Symmetry: C3
Subunit: 456 residues, 3 copies
């Protein structure tokens, strides 16, 4: 027989349990093959890809990644795809692990306001990517149309304390990283494989701060990890920990005791972790500019007792987590809304600036602006700043080097340029600095920075 | 002893059987080591990389990839490399799996009109890439100078019903994707790893349509899969199927039951597939813009009985295969030749347009131009089109959104821009539309589109 | 218990042995767990990244990669990080394989002139990357802040004849490849993952020529191979040889008998090789333009007896090693220093030109300039050259094709353009040619070439 030769469906039909990221449906917990009815709906919708940055996502079930599907090897799946009448595009679905043309795409073409159905037997056990396969296929995937389906072995996977759902994607906006507003899809960047954002679960901060994943010392954690692409291959890594097991798709090979593992575009793996020490453990794409310049960081936060014989040291994790160490950056979202409304206050700028200053400026000038005498000059009550507060704009954009004096002390060092910061970010950061630590006050506007950036 | 320690060559010398892609030489079918004489000739030649697009390829044996070589572990190989007198460049060969300096490159330097020879023992069993290694090495490989050599284990590989030869490459043209004419090699794009085409077996459509690979339900298929690069790593994937086995080079590890697998630049693998359901199964690089925007798709077509218990559904595979669902796009080749000759007719444009309309326009407007009332407006007998047929050029190039009325019906939707289409493609598509479904007729020229594209 | 549960530290504390690339510390050779004290110092310093090209590296222990650390599974490590007072930036360390927040980064933040300490138990056996994790993390890694730590199994690794240390990195300069002078870090190229150099051990030629690694026929060689990134994934390959074993990090899986293997960004592997035939064996990133256009080549040179039954052929390895076949390119370094001083002589140019002519020109015109009658025209005593020595600049920059006559002989062929060469390189090469083989003499300057390059 073929694989998954376990007998005809038995019992009543089961209406499948779909879940939203980062959660997973429960184990099916049964010893017989069933007829499973799956109902999934496409919705096109604006969501925030970053604070104050909107994007028109195309979604399976209202989220990126799409709703998680869970069935048993040998089940017969009757798949119903609906396309909501508000959609502008037609859509379909290709499930990896399906035995048949297009993995379903050939049979699931669905116009706005319509519904399609096709039936397949789940012959192949494993974790699998699904995605839209409507021309132009790359545009549909780039807009968020991907998720995971798990096909369990007949005895089920081994029990663990937590199961989570994490999926990487590369995204292509017309504007640069953190440029505010509604950002269109950019076909030219996509063809060139030059993404502006690389994310877990559809947004910067989706899994950081108050949205981190949780477990306790001693517990086991399984993560179902997808790479929707469309184009990038992930050097997938956990900072400060190790994977007990890594298994790709439905493969017979299992790797154990590794920290860094390559996930193909369109690939999926199951990883297992055992919590040993408290703190924040970071999932990244270790093609490092993705993790630290484009959004590709997620957090598993572990609580419980210290083990000083295993790890003993201070805990200053803002040095690398930067502006994602805090619970959120909601002050930036709020300042951006107020600016669009024409109601932006000095305090709106101050609080947005405070959020952005973490990492970006604090690593050298300190969280309190004091710096370090002779090494990093102070921003707190800075005579150099007060002497020409406008020159601060050029210093942020283009850097500063050479001999200077600040609060009666000599410095001869190098502050690198930070031209990648957007006009609103520079304005908000400097407004924060002017209104803290007994500095003179006032404000800097995005338009002020735009003028300075444009000077030859 | 070393590996492959099977004794001295015995019997008469064997003159090796070389084959052209996508075919493989027969199994050697012998139990003793032999002296094998290999004769391979370099030829530089123009071929079509895409319909109406010519390129000067550099080849081993007249094809891209080059002729397939098949020997037994423990054989002594006497390798003769000839460089045809029509060649402009010198050439050589590096075979992966050879034990010695440059894998042969050090001993096989050959000027136009000359011949070289060197001898090696095949110590290492496996599938291996060979390629040119003449400075500048990257240029030689980018021009097509790569292929595969199989070194069999002494007992031979297990029997299968079919063996095929498929090799990925990245290519660098001065012009953009599908821009017509003789296209030079582009060194700047190559250094930046920004290819214009990513292909199987040296051309768009090399393995699609009437050139697809074949098998029947129940049969086993082995594919020898190479990645010549020069630069890209393939997220190699089969749509709608699974690999029974994947084995890299001569490695001891074998992965089983996977659908997606990473092939390094310069790497090679042997994959095995068992046919279960009829239809078209697609080999792709799942870095998806390569597969659907740059040519990286090949087809295995399976015939035999349906199995409705495994897969039951409609078969509209043009939604993702697009303009490669048809047997070929020969109308485009012909229209391009006629244009170069100054003899391009309206009907030449109509038939080229018909070929290009599949996927590109048909996914929303339908194959018959009827659209879908209230959702996608008709192109068939379109009053909006007839009212200003020239405005159609701007609509294709730059998109259309907002409220419009077409054949007495309101629409308020979004047609994305399609600026990547070349001037001849837009002209031919629109000429097809004007001369179908009782539209007014006439024609649009490439020069008309060039003028509109250049407007601010 | 956890892993590495071998008992409390015993004996006196051990002060750890650190080594500079390409060497490794000795095996620890002990049967008990110890307290190991590690002292490592950050130094920021200018070094030559290529001949006549300086770069400001940020280093662990004065080298790129940083000092190699070697401990035993179950050891307690007391880690002291110092930042030299000459540093301008703060720094820290993340060791892969550490169980705890940031792999240490959270506890090791260290300002210029300061020292930090933290303690960890080495629970996980394997080879692991360490690196700086100070915001902006990508800039710190791109500047050279990475190395390897080995955690031995309790019984030690199997004995071999040689152990070596090789680490790949991608680098981002404002200037182009081989443009002379002090080159700043380029943030824009880094974000886009578009490196100007891709190197082993921090420089072009670090492991070629007189700096090659050595072994003899019959000996075993272990290489500890890292990929510091920040961004690239290596298609890591040995030309003309095979790896007996490849093992990633501390993984349970071991691959055997492969030639090409994918190393993730931030990944590390241990490879094993047995020398079988004399000659130069080349370690490369087989994303080929990295190996042959950006510096990603290193050499293992094997001495001993020939084995003509395994490999029999000539040895012209300059056809692919090009300008790295020679012991060094010190003439280029010297010509660049003299030019900066205003003391550049004709002979300085001649010797720099001689070094650069290897591969670049010699593959077609020969090492003696004679060419090949009717196929490649001579540069030796060339009447065509003497007739208009200035036209030689355009020929190098923009190529030459069509019918020409040279020393009473007809040619109708194609010399590709070589625009990637810098102004000093073209000037030096042509000065070499003018002063060899009874050509007229004189000189060409970098300023002459700059003027010609700028002509429309
Ligand atoms: C990596 C270190 C570093 C980072 C990050 C950094 N700075 Fe600086 N900054 C310096 C150094 C060093 C100087 C002194 C330059 C000199 O000696 O010529 C400086 C000088 C300045 C000055 C002028 C002198 C003074 O004390 O008033 C201002 C204002 C300033 N920085 C603001 C900022 C702001 C705002 C940020 C973040 C957006 C930032 N800096 C990020 C190192 C840094
Ligand atoms: C993804 C959907 C989609 C694709 C693909 C697409 N179109 Fe359209 N097209 C539309 C929609 C929707 C409109 C109506 C726009 C509006 O409501 O403002 C439209 C409008 C038009 C119109 C003007 C209205 C009419 O019916 O005459 C023309 C002409 C047209 N398309 C031609 C084409 C051609 C030719 C192609 C391919 C080259 C193409 N379209 C591809 C969705 C699409
Ligand atoms: C791949 C082959 C190749 C390489 C590499 C190459 N050349 Fe040439 N070169 C030629 C050919 C062929 C011609 C003749 C062109 C023709 O027939 O129109 C030529 C012509 C010339 C000429 C003019 C004719 C003569 O003999 O005086 C000069 C000068 C020259 N090359 C110099 C160089 C220099 C200097 C280099 C390296 C920097 C170089 N070439 C690299 C193939 C090459
Ligand atoms: Cu879709
Ligand atoms: Cu897919
Ligand atoms: Cu060649
Ligand atoms: Cu190779
Ligand atoms: Cu650092
Ligand atoms: Cu790391």
């Amino acid at each position: 027989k073929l694989p998954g030769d376990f007998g005809p469906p038995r019992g009543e039909p089961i209406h499948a349990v779909l879940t939203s990221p980062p959660l997973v449906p429960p184990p099916v917990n049964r010893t017989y093959p069933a007829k499973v009815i799956v109902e999934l709906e496409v919705v096109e919708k604006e969501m925030q890809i970053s604070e104050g940055v909107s994007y028109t996502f195309w979604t399976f079930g209202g989220t990126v990644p799409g709703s998680f599907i869970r069935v048993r090897q040998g089940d017969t799946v009757e798949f119903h795809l609906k396309n909501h009448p508000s959609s502008k595009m037609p859509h379909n679905i290709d499930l990896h692990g399906v035995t048949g043309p297009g993995g379903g795409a050939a049979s699931s073409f669905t116009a706005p306001g319509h519904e399609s159905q096709f039936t397949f037997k789940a012959l192949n056990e494993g974790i699998y990517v699904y995605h839209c396969a409507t021309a132009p296929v790359g545009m549909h995937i780039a807009n968020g149309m991907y998720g995971l389906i798990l096909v369990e072995p007949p005895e089920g996977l081994p029990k663990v304390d937590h199961e989570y759902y994490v999926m990487q994607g590369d995204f292509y906006t017309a504007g640069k990283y953190r440029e505010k507003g509604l950002q269109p899809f950019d076909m030219e960047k996509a063809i060139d494989e030059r993404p502006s954002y690389v994310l877990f679960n559809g947004a910067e901060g989706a899994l950081t701060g108050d949205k981190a994943l949780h477990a306790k010392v001693g517990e086991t954690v399984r993560i179902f990890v997808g790479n929707g692409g469309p184009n990038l291959v992930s050097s997938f890594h956990v900072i400060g920990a190790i994977f007990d097991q890594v298994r790709y798709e439905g493969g017979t090979n299992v790797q154990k005791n590794v920290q860094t593992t390559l996930i193909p575009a369109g690939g999926a793996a199951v990883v297992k972790f055992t919590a040993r020490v408290p703190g924040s453990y970071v999932l990244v794409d270790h093609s490092i500019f993705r993790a630290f310049n484009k959004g590709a960081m997620a957090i598993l936060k572990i609580d419980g007792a210290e083990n000083k014989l295993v790890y003993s040291g201070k805990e200053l994790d803002s040095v690398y987590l930067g502006d994602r160490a805090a619970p959120n950056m909601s002050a930036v979202t709020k300042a951006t809304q107020a600016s669009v409304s024409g109601t932006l206050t000095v305090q709106d700028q101050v609080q947005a600036g405070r959020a952005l200053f973490a990492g970006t400026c604090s690593v050298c000038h300190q969280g309190n602006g004091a710096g370090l005498p002779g090494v990093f000059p102070p921003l707190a009550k800075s005579d150099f700043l007060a002497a020409d507060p406008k020159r601060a704009m050029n210093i942020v954009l283009h850097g500063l080097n050479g001999k200077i004096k600040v609060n009666g002390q000599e410095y001869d060092s190098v502050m690198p340029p930070m031209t990648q910061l957007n006009d609103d970010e520079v304005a908000n950061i400097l407004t924060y600095v002017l209104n803290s630590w007994d500095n003179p006050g006032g404000r800097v506007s995005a338009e002020d920075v735009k003028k300075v950036r444009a000077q030859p």
